[PDB]
From Swiss-Prot, chain B:
Similarity annotation: Belongs to the universal ribosomal protein uL3 family.
Bias kind Basic residues: ranges: 17-30
SS bonds (residue pairs): none
Database matches in PROSITE patterns: RIBOSOMAL_L3 (PS00474)
Function description: Component of the large ribosomal subunit. The ribosome is a large ribonucleoprotein complex responsible for the synthesis of proteins in the cell.
Gene that produces this protein: RPL3
Covalent cross-link Glycyl lysine isopeptide (Lys-Gly) (interchain with G-Cter in SUMO2) as placed by the record, residue numbers: K38, K223, K225, K285, K365, K385, K392
Molecular function as annotated in GO: RNA binding; structural constituent of ribosome
Modification Tele-methylhistidine, positions: H244
Name recorded for this polypeptide: Large ribosomal subunit protein uL3
Crosslink feature (Glycyl lysine isopeptide (Lys-Gly) (interchain with G-Cter in SUMO1)) location: K293
Sorted UniProt keywords: Acetylation, Cytoplasm, Isopeptide bond, Methylation, Nucleus, Phosphoprotein, Ribonucleoprotein, Ribosomal protein, Ubl conjugation
RNA sequence: UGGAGCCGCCGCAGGUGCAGAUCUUGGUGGUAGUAGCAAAUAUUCAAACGAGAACUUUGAAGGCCGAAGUGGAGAAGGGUU
RNA sequence: CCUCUGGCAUGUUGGAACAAUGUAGGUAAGGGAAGUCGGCAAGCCGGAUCCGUAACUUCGGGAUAAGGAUUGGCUCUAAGG
RNA sequence: GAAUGGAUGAACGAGAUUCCCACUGUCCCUACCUACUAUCCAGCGAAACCACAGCCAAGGGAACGGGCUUGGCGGAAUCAG
RNA sequence: UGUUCACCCACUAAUAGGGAACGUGAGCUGGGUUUAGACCGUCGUGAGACAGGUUAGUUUUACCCUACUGAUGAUGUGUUGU
């Protein structure tokens, strides 16, 4: 398929996407901003730290009510969280793009995450029963992720 | 309409932003006015709140019902091991204010002091004042040093010494010794500066600053109490039992029509850990620390002319949440700001003291030395060993 | 692996609660392929599933 | 929709 | 971009031009990763399975319902649970 | 209220903290309703045995009126078939 | 004001008052403790409301302005209240 | 006394007077006014009436913006600490 923002030198730029993933769009977005521009081996480390809370993902855009944390000071920011599902869902994606580099025949530990982008995916809906017999929505806001790595060292 | 029944308002506005103090070490916001006439001296000291206790004393205010009657009296022990002067720092008057002009540091500086200059000492290579101290042993540096001191002689007006604590000698956890600027108040600036230039790298004990029966101002940070509601933080009335949305509140924040809530209205926020300068705390006892001529001299602390035992101010089982006061200490009347272990600035008074009460000579009759770690009933361990007799642990 | 069925059948064979059914946790897999009763009655006789004793309530 | 008030409460009562 | 029809002029005809109607139907935001997932005392250790275990299962312990039961059976109602 | 038989996994989640406000419990020196529209709320009282029981009365009641004392553990005695 | 019933009245009342005894955090005057919250985190995740928006003083003005006039002034993004 | 108001006792230095949407109900309370239930008086043929008396009667929502309270931070100074 067409990715937004096609690569500069396709020769040496592996690809990935994962469509229609049950991962909070907003959390997935912030952790995708965090990861962006990293060398793939750093990125992986960074997400496993986020998984165990040794580093945070600063929640910059979608930061309404999100707590402060000392770990955010690394990023130059006050907010920050440890979104685990998001890190588990773009550690799989990284795995796949790394897969495809290896298949394509690129140096895997020269790969920079050049482009990554979280879109909203069509919403699910299940209901929540409310006071005075009102029935409100209770909808997941899943996300399409996609990304592009590149040989840069 | 007017408020029906008048009442004075809760809390003082002369104390607010009721926020958590930036500093931990309480700043001396004003040193006394150096008359140029009396000889040079230090105006301030830096102690530590070790703990409270009793005293007993004959009082001599004639007229009172308590004249020639032994009262008891609470007191704070401020353990005050001698400070080390490691600097001077010249100031000059301007119409803008009082600009710092030139800071000359000493040659050798302790790791007690050097600690302060790094946020993480474990991780540092401890490289501070390293290229500085090169100055103190050559022709070039020593000359520049002298020219700096000369310039300060020409230009400066206020001179403050920089000293720091001897964190080494305390029962506290921390090693990072508190520095502080202390002002030299006395004769002419050239005399004033050559005094502090002589004192450089040297000890300064408490008795050199203060004397007995002297009113001094304690400066420190208050014992902090976190987020607190308006009823705690402002001592507002509680509302009654029936109040539906809670009752440790203020009911009417404000009127409608200055349509903003005013700065004078009581709100919940930080209670405690404020900076506060309590004044007129009379020194009952400047106490000599433990020392050795052949054996220990532990007596010299809490023994009085009338008691004559072998105590120190340390109670049985020590001062609680603190340690042993093994160093020289002052003994103020009454409570003072802050917690146990808190660093505490003393300061000579801003004020011409000439009240009957402020010139009163204190002869102590008896220092209570019973444990504070429970209801104590024995003044010393030897007394306890006498009273009890032998125990199964023998 | 999953022995809620074997505990039910065992209980019904023993005519006890299923509190009182004890399945040997070491020999689990043998119990797992017990599906029928009479397979279970066999395991009752072999001593892999056993009726526990009553919790003692002394009258003393 | 949201309940808000009872029938005999009729919020802003000004008789 | 798309992939099969469409327009100019002269006449005739009309269910012919929207920002509003607490307008109708459909969709989407900010609010917000916020409120919230607090009734009824309680969980812990090891193992098994398994890609994966705070939650499954087994064993061990600690707890509750305390025979007006959180037990054992029906009526009505459900309709394959 | 505690237990066996039988039954459950704390009622749609977990973890870390222990701030203000709350919801639900408790306790408070001296005073004792001064609080408030109003003793609202909570507190006192409480079982049993033994005494003792007013006004009034439709003579039945009032009446657990009020007001008092005792109560455990242990070792015996006497009395009831 | 006399079966539109008048006067009475023991017993009874989750009925309306007043006083006394007791008792108490109702109060003087507030304080400390416990549990569940709120708090921070993982997972999950609504709603009302919404012309645009959101610092003030005064003026005039449909005679009480966030916006206008004249002044004061104005510093990202946020957290708990 | 629901009261505003009023009056009385007591203390006191003094027990001055007002304003802020007759300040202040997403601050309370709800005693009183002011639904529906009922009683009494007067009025009405009556249904009903009464600034005439009585008793019983659901007091919702803040997570938005501001304001205030406290809490991280912000631009600058080359970075950092004092
Ligand atoms: Mg619901
Ligand atoms: Mg319903
Ligand atoms: Mg006044
Ligand atoms: Mg209420
Ligand atoms: Mg003590
Ligand atoms: Mg076609
Ligand atoms: Mg038509
Ligand atoms: Mg339209
Ligand atoms: Mg939450
Ligand atoms: Mg059954
Ligand atoms: Mg529970
Ligand atoms: Mg559970
Ligand atoms: Mg349930
Ligand atoms: Mg009390
Ligand atoms: Mg009163
Ligand atoms: Mg009263
Ligand atoms: Mg009551
Ligand atoms: Mg009676
Ligand atoms: Mg008549
Ligand atoms: Mg008649
Ligand atoms: Mg009549
Ligand atoms: Mg407006
Ligand atoms: Mg008003
Ligand atoms: Mg209001
Ligand atoms: Mg209200
Ligand atoms: Mg009422
Ligand atoms: Mg009515
Ligand atoms: Mg919140």
């Amino acid at each position: 398929v067409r990715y937004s923002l096609d690569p500069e030198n396709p020769t040496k730029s592996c690809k990935s996407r994962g469509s229609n993933l049950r991962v909070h769009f907003k959390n997935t977005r912030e952790t995708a901003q965090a990861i962006k521009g990293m060398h793939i081996r750093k990125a992986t480390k960074y997400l496993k730290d986020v998984t165990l809370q040794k580093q945070c993902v600063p929640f910059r855009r979608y930061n309404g009510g999100v707590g402060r944390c000392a770990q955010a000071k690394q990023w130059g920011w006050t907010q920050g969280r440890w979104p685990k599902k998001s890190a588990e869902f773009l550690l799989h994606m990284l795995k796949n793009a790394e897969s495809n580099a290896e298949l394509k025949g690129l140096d895997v530990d020269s790969l920079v995450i050049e482009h990554i982008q979280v879109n909203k995916a069509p919403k699910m809906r299940r209901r929540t029963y409310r006071a005075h017999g009102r029935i409100n929505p209770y909808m997941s806001s899943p996300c399409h992720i996609e990304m592009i790595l590149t040989e840069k060292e | 309409s007017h408020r029906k029944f008048s009442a004075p308002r809760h809390g003082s506005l002369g104390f607010l932003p009721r926020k958590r103090s930036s500093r931990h070490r309480g700043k001396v916001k004003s040193f006394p006015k150096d008359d140029p006439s009396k000889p040079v001296h230090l105006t301030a000291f830096l102690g530590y709140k070790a703990g409270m206790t009793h005293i007993v004393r004959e009082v001599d205010r004639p007229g009172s019902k308590v004249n020639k009657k032994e009262v008891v009296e609470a007191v704070t022990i401020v353990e005050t091991p001698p400070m080390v002067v490691v600097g001077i720092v010249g100031y000059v008057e301007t119409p803008r204010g009082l600009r710092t002009f030139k800071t000359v540091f000493a040659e050798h500086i302790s790791d007690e002091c050097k600690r302060r200059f790094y946020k993480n000492w474990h991780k540092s290579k401890k490289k501070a004042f390293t290229k500085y101290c090169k100055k103190w042993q050559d022709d070039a540096g020593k000359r520049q040093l002298d020219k700096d001191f000369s310039s300060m002689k020409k230009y400066c007006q206020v001179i403050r010494v920089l000293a720091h604590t001897q964190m080494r000698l305390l029962p506290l956890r921390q090693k990072k010794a508190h520095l502080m600027e202390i002002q030299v108040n006395g004769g002419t600036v050239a005399e004033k500066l050559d005094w502090a230039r002589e004192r450089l790298e040297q000890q300064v004990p408490v008795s050199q600053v203060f004397g007995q029966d002297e009113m001094i101002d304690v400066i420190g940070v208050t014992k902090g109490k976190g987020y607190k509601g308006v009823t705690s933080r402002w001592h507002t009335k509680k509302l009654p039992r029936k109040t539906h949305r809670g009752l440790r509140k203020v009911a009417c924040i404000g009127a409608w029509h200055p349509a903003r809530v005013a700065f004078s209205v009581a709100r919940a926020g930080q209670k405690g850990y404020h900076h506060r300068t309590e004044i007129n705390k009379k020194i009952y006892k400047i106490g000599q620390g433990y020392l050795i001529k052949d054996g220990k001299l532990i007596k010299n602390n809490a023994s009085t002319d009338y008691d004559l035992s072998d105590k120190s101010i340390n109670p049985l089982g020590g001062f609680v949440h603190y340690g042993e006061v093994t160093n020289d200490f002052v003994m103020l009347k009454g409570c003072v700001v802050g917690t146990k272990k808190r660093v505490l600035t003393l300061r000579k008074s801003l004020l011409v003291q000439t009240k009957r009460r402020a010139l009163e000579k204190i002869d102590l009759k008896f220092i209570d030395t019973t444990s504070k770690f429970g209801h104590g009933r024995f003044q010393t361990v030897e007394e306890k060993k006498a009273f009890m007799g032998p125990l199964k642990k023998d | 692996s999953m022995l809620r069925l074997q505990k039910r059948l065992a209980s019904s064979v023993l005519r006890c609660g299923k509190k009182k059914v004890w399945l040997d946790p070491n020999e689990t897999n043998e119990i797992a392929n017990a599906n029928s009763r009479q397979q279970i009655r066999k395991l009752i006789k072999d001593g892999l599933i056993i009726r526990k004793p009553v919790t003692v309530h002394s009258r003393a | 929709g949201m309940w808000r008030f009872y029938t005999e409460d009729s919020p802003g009562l000004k008789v």
